[PDB]
Amino acid sequence: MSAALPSIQLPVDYNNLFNEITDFLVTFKQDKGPKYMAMLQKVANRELNSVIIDLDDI
Amino acid sequence: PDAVFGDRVRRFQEFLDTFTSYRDSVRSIQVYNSNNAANYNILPHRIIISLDDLREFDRSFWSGILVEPAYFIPPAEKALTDLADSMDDVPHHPWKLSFKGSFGAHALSPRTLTAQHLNKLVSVEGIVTKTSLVRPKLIRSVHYAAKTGRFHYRDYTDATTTLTTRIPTPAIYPTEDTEGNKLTTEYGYSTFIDHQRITVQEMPEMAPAGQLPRSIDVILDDDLVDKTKPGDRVNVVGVFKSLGAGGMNQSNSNTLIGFKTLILGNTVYPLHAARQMLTDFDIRNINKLSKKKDIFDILSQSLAPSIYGHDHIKKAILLMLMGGVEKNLENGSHLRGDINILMVGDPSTAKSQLLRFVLNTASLAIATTGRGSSGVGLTAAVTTDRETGERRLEAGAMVLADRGVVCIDEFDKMTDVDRVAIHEVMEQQTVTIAKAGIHTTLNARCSVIAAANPVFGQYDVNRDPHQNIALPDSLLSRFDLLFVVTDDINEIRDRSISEHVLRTHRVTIPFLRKYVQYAKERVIPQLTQEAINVIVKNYTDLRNDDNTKKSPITARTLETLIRLATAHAKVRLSKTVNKVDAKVAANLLRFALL
Amino acid sequence: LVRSLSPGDIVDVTGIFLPAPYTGFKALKAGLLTETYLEAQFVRQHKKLTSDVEERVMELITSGDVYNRLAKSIAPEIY
Ligand SMILES: Nc1ncnc2c1ncn2[C@@H]1O[C@H](COP(=O)(O)OP(=O)(O)OP(=O)(O)O)[C@@H](O)[C@H]1O
């Protein structure tokens, strides 16, 4: 559609972040194995329903 | 466009010399704001164009701004904002105007409306007493096709561009642009702005006595919100503007105005007839006269230039007006640090004289007249629905009293229902109310000044000095000074009076208001063991002499006896609680009690 | 995070921001007003019998001093 429906080209996209969450797989080994993946197991067995995705792990 | 655009471009080469002195200013204000934001571990876009740089050498361009202010201001913005990037583009918000100056006879007092200049530049002054809500508003939202990864762009126009009556977009949010992609919107890159209306009354002294005060209203923007406390001598300037469809949007339209007066303006200023910047000269002279050891007495006599004597009263007013501090207790209730004096006297003895001229030098302390409807310290839950779904606890009379002074009259000529309100606001700094809504503890630093009259004429001497008004002692115990003005008749006393009233039908004031408002910004000593040793001896002898004589005094009277001397050192402008302050504090109570 | 707040909680919430449309009487009134809220993410609450507290119950038993030290304990701020 015409009349200024397209915008300016922004350098900030999402696909550059999309694959950067794909490298939020098992790679964070400083903090018994992948610790945020360890919390993923204590939800699937149905006892607690709140994950915590902090900024410390970022 | 060539005709409507040509004198734009000829101005576009013209006004660039009219910011030879501002093209430095407009970039210096941002380069550090660009710097500090990169090293945190803030100012809006204000470009004050004076009259002088646009009247000395342009005349055709001049009077267009004061006749038709609708084809010129968005020219001036668009040619402004390129200079923001042409100066600053290397590091990786429209900069609208303010236009300060004079005007040459457009001080329309809004009791008068115009037939000449509608839709023009208007200068308006007065007081505001409405202070409506705050609410954001969209101007431009950006959409994003999450499939194919492509973005979009959309701007909404409204009755906020101030000048051009564009075709409105009667829409809130669109969905499904010409594709099969579910539209997503990025709200971090969508821009907002606020919107606040305020009604302005008439300055009720220069409007002549044939009418009540009138009012109009003004829509401002973010740059000067929360600047307008209710009770300020404000002075705004903006465009005059009508909006709304009158006569067609409903049919038959009989006796319904459809042309609302609005002001879409800029750049308010408080005035004074808080900001008083003084030079090195006057700030040094006030220290030079501070070196004199008499200036506490000179200020007493240079206050009320009409009335003889009462130097015990005259020093008290300047002692009260300047104010004593309250040091809040850490994890504890702070005490009374307010001071609250009282008067009473047999009539026509200047009890109400000095009460009205404290309001002229008040330094933003607007008082009431003591008419005691419920509203003296409360809200009474007045909301007026605030555009269908907003309830507001509208501030009655304590938002003006904060860090200021008030005065009310006729205590015994009141009902019961005000007296219960003055109980709460004296024992406690705050009121808290839940009428049909929200419990809210809003804070208040007030200091009353009283004026009542005795009941049975001249019956003070032949009866008890106490109970002489017999209003409840809930307030007398919460007050300290009960000055009883005498009116004794002596042939040299009244003869001296008779000429002094006669000589006035035909050390300065603005220096005085500077001295106190400079002395509210100096440090507070509180600390000398010498001065605290003498006053408690000074208490104990009258602690033997209060109970076997006139009036019993209490422990809170000691908190006066620090507080008067504490402010008395604030007159001295020093950080050492001396000895000499403790002698005037004792001697002032000795006349107040004997 | 529900059922974890109370009236009178001197607290703080951390959370994300968004406005909301009004979708009612949007032409005559409700031009482009916004009436936003904030959306919560985290609560960091503050200032809250023979179960690891018996050590201080013994401090009254060993020291004794019922009639006077406890009398000086409650409200020692008077004369
Ligand atoms: N004690 C006084 N000394 C000098 N002038 C006085 C005195 N009392 C009154 N006057 C003159 O009288 C005029 C008005 O006095 P005023 O009306 O304030 O009395 P008041 O304080 O109002 O008493 P009340 O409140 O009982 O009416 C003033 O212009 C003042 O010059």
The whole-angstrom Rg of chain A is 18 Å
Oligomer kind: part of a larger assembly
Strands side by side in the biggest sheet of chain B? 3-2-4-5
Number of strands of chain A: 0
Structural class by secondary-structure content of chain A: mainly alpha
Largest interface: B-C, 16 and 15 residues
Main sheet specs of chain A:
none
- What distance lies between the first and last C-alpha atoms of chain B, to the nearest angstrom? 87 Å
Q: What's the overall geometry of chain B?
A: elongated
Structural class of chain B: alpha+beta
Number of helices of chain B: 15
Give the ordered list of helices and strands of chain B. Answer: HHHHEEEEEEEHHHEHHEEHEHHHHH
Bound molecules: adenosine-5'-triphosphate
- Strand residues, percent of chain A: under 5%
Identify the overall geometry of chain A: elongated
So how many helices of chain A?
A: 2
Residues in helices of chain A, as a percent range: 25-40%
If you compute it from the alpha carbons, what radius of gyration of chain B comes out, rounded to the nearest whole angstrom? 31 Å
The tally of beta strands of chain B, per DSSP, is: 11
Share of helical residues of chain B = 25-40%
Elements of chain A, N to C (H/E): HH
Subunit structure (chain B): Component of the MCM2-7 complex. The complex forms a toroidal hexameric ring with the proposed subunit order MCM2-MCM6-MCM4-MCM7-MCM3-MCM5; loaded onto DNA, forms a head-head double hexamer. Interacts with CSM1.
Protein name (chain B): DNA replication licensing factor MCM3
Domain MCM (chain B): 295-502
Catalytic activity (chain B): ATP + H2O = ADP + phosphate + H(+)
